[PDB]
Amino acid sequence: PVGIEAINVYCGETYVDVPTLFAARQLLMMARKSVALHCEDAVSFAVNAAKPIVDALSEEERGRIELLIVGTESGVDFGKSLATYVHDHLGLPRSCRLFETKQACYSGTAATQMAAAVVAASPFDGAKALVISSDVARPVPHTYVEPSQGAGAVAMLISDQPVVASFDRGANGFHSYEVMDLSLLTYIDCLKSSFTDYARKVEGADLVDSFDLLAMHTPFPGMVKGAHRAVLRKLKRMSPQAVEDDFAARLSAAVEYPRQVGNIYAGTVFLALASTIDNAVIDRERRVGIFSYGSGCSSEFYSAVVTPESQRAVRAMGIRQALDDRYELSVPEYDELLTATAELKFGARDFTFDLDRFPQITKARFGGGTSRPRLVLEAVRNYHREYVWLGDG
Amino acid sequence: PVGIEAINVYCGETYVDVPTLFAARQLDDSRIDNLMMARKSVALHCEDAVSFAVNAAKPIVDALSEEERGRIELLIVGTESGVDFGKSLATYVHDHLGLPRSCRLFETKQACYSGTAATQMAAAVVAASPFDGAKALVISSDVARPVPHTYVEPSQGAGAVAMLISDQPVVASFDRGANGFHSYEVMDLSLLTYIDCLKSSFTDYARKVEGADLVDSFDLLAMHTPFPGMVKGAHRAVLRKLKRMSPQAVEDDFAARLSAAVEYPRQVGNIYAGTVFLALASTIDNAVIDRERRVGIFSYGSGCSSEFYSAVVTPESQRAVRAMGIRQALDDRYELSVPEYDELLTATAELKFGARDFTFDLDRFPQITKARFGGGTSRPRLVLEAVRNYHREYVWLG
Known part of the structure; x- marks a missing residue:
């Protein structure tokens, strides 16, 4: 582990x-x-x-x-x-x-x-x-x-x-290629294709059913919202209202600290992960789907398990204060x-x-x-x- | 593996x-020999x-x-x-x-x-x-x-x-977990830092590898080569301190274990990131690889970070590298x-x-x-x- x-x-x-x-x-x-x-x-x-x-x-x-x-x-x-x-x-x-x-x-x-x-x-x-x-x-x-x-x-x-956070071993999808507007499109392409690569390595992966929570690289919360919407619509053909509800349930905790901090580049996805753990109710073992991106580009979709002990350890750091x-x-x-x-x-x-x-x-x-x-x-x-x-x- | x-x-x-x-x-035409x-x-x-x-x-x-x-x-x-x-x-x-x-x-x-x-x-x-x-x-x-x-x-x-x-x-088959490190912030002094890292990274390797000896554990050595004179000086300084060997024994050890590794670097110069790997390729191409042989590998970067590790090379290694035609x-x-x-x-x-x-x-x-x-x-x-x-x-x- x-x-x-x-x-x-x-x-x-x-x-x-x-x-x-x-x-x-x-x-x-x-x-x-x-x-x-x-x-x-x-x-x-x-x-x-x-x-x-x-x-x-x-x-x-x-x-x-x-x-x-x-x-x-x-x-x-x-x-x-x-x-x-x-x-x-x-x-x-x-x-x-x-x-x-x-x-x-x-x-x-x-x-x-x-x-x-x-x-x-x-x-x-x-x-x-x-x-x-x-x-x-x-x-x-x-x-x-x-x-x-x-x-x-x-x-x-x-x-x-x-x-x-205990990483799911081997549960890693990648999407990378050279690319230089296109910025939303490339992020969406990486979220969809890195998740698809994850699903190729992890029998039965679903972008809704496999993860209690999501944390993602957050250039700004609007980008995460728009990318979440594009990818759930393309992969699952879910209704707009169901996609809005899923964003509120699984991403609103993640974007809380980023919306108070802004894009910090390397660290943003980890800040979203800390924000997820701090701002959601972790009542037992829960799995987080994690999407990391860098323009230019390289991307990875991976997952980890968090527990009440996770929440206690992160709360003791006093990030919100x-x-x-x-x-x-x-x-x-x-x-x-x-x-x-x-x-x-x-x-x-x-x-x-x-x-x-x-x-x-x-x-x-x-x-x-x-x-x-x-x-x-x-x-x-x-x-x-x-x-x-x-x-x- | x-x-x-x-x-x-x-x-x-x-x-x-x-x-x-x-x-x-x-x-100054003197320092060409250095x-x-x-x-x-x-x-x-x-x-x-x-x-x-x-x-x-x-x-x-x-x-x-x-x-x-x-x-x-x-x-x-x-x-x-x-x-x-x-x-x-x-x-x-x-x-x-x-x-x-x-x-x-x-x-x-x-x-x-x-x-x-x-x-x-x-x-x-x-x-x-x-x-x-x-x-x-x-x-x-x-x-x-x-x-x-x-x-x-x-x-x-x-x-x-x-x-x-x-x-x-x-x-080259890496010896799993056989890795010594020595790293710290430091800003001329460069020969002193290289020597400190070679000695200390090898000491760290010996801490993790029971019975490690900078002479007895390795048939061959390949090292980051800012220039071949530095490697020769650092080799001499570190065997002087760790083994108290005679000057002739140290010279003979350089000839036997490092002269192959410096052959390509002395024709190319320092290429920074790649030089230790050029030294490894040079060791495989220029030494006789007659059986399984263990290479001791010392990597260094100014500023500084350093690692001592080891790998096994074989006659099949020598055939695979020879087919790349590096010397030609x-x-x-x-x-x-x-x-x-x-x-x-x-x-x-x-x-x-x-x-x-x-x-x-x-x-x-x-x-x-x-x-x-x-x-x-x-x-x-x-x-x-x-x-x-x-x-x-x-x-x-x-």
Whole structure:
């Protein structure tokens, strides 16, 4: 039995209201989107997500972490993986593989499935992997995608003690091909074809009857709704009302955190999975059908079992409280953060952050007042990234 | 039983002589003996990590039945020559190899460790599958752009190594769970970090493998080769510390267990992700494989992550690699003058990272494409022809 032993999320410390940004931009089913401080990156998001699940381990349990993979499209170097920085801030043993995975929003699932295979293939019991999906996409002002784009990381311990979600072994359908508008069509093609591939490997698979709940990559909840509708209509020829009811029953819990966070690329499907577990009633063993996608493209349909112990383990992470504690940006504050963030470019040799550039945000959050301390990026010195703990006091 | 079913390399169609380049660059002629490099592969201007990967993998994909090719369920490209923040090289590579759409596609990144990462992940997926006959295609591909007037430049080549990973591991059968790791963030120091990783990753291997000995457990060694002098120095440093062997015993061990592994790398240069796999192919091709022999394998990427693992090779391994004709392909490369080399570097740099629109002149070096890339008796090669609104477009130049 292999899967997620522990899960946690860091969706940043600020948000902007989506209807307010829409209006301000003079232009989804989106409510709020996470915004990164100018001095945050995929590394610092990844460290903030993983630190609670790493610190909850005994010494002996942490020493069995032999794999750390970061799934991202927010890389910082041609060669140097995010996983090197992330390892160095989590007190992990050096007896560990470290690398990064890339394939748009499929990067996290790629990492998770490799790590599950490593755990299952090991001749030794008790192998552990840490997989972190982390992205800090830079929104382009005056694009229709902007208000759908968030910042977040989702950290998962993958082991043979899968309290949070136990993966159905071998129950994996894939649909991948090179492709560059088409974006809804490609997502729908992958959902339908990855599920069909799943059904080829799993005797009697049905997209309604096999799964109590669904969790899917969520570019925005409207996309998930439209894709769910297209695929159920094509595969099962169900009535519009029956399709609407199925969305309410099986996907409304999954899209709750994504509609408060926005697309975080790699981590979105895992945030939808955490959201499913947190926002649905898990009264016994229930199976979740999971659809992961990355544009360009690659896709996978897989499944896992969750239990009341899953719900208790995820509730103890306090995700809803963390989201509700975020500082609300005005649109002007959001615009100044975008401007400050863009100053650090890919391939910069030397760059120093002003950690106090937005004292309104660092007064209230990042160790301010009631708030948790956070790792942030402080500088790049001869290509080397240097992090500080804000709120160390 | 899991490992490499088939292996092939593509190390480009051109080379520049390393001593000739040292002299043209007016680098200190002393350090040629420290590099131990003979010649380096050079990419044409219109080649990238995708086109390199397709040229490497195409013969091993074409040799499969339609049914065998149907069972490829994983393609991973290991590279530090990515073209996009999001879009993996594996998408383009998939599209040019006629692979089924029932495949996971992604890229691995961790400097020259990227290939081994991809290989070990694929091995785990094949071992873990409840179904027999799962196959994965892993391609290590890099086209590093040398910086003229650096001492690094003459050690840097261009190359891809493609491997089918399966439960029919003719080329190399992995020792299951025999894996030592040593990884930590670190930013010259590079020889010290390589040595620390070789010693510590092997120590970790010995922790998991009862009775492991860096001399007695392995008939042969194959290692990531930034240049052959580094491997020779690191071998010496680590046997000095772990075994306290005499200098002559250490020299003789290098000759017996590493001289085959460095033979192709000393003619190609560092190709990053693929170099350890080029070293493995070189070990199989250049050593006498007279019976089952165990190779100790050390993979390393700056920054850093490292792994020590082992595999068994056999006379059938040596027959399978010999049929790929790697030595004849390396001997067939067009010999560049330094001015031709300098012109290729200049033409390459014209395509900038993040470029949206760019069109190649595929006939810009007609003296090269007359002889190679399908010219004369040369074999056809995929090349990069254009970037159109970020989309990369390739031509079969044969």
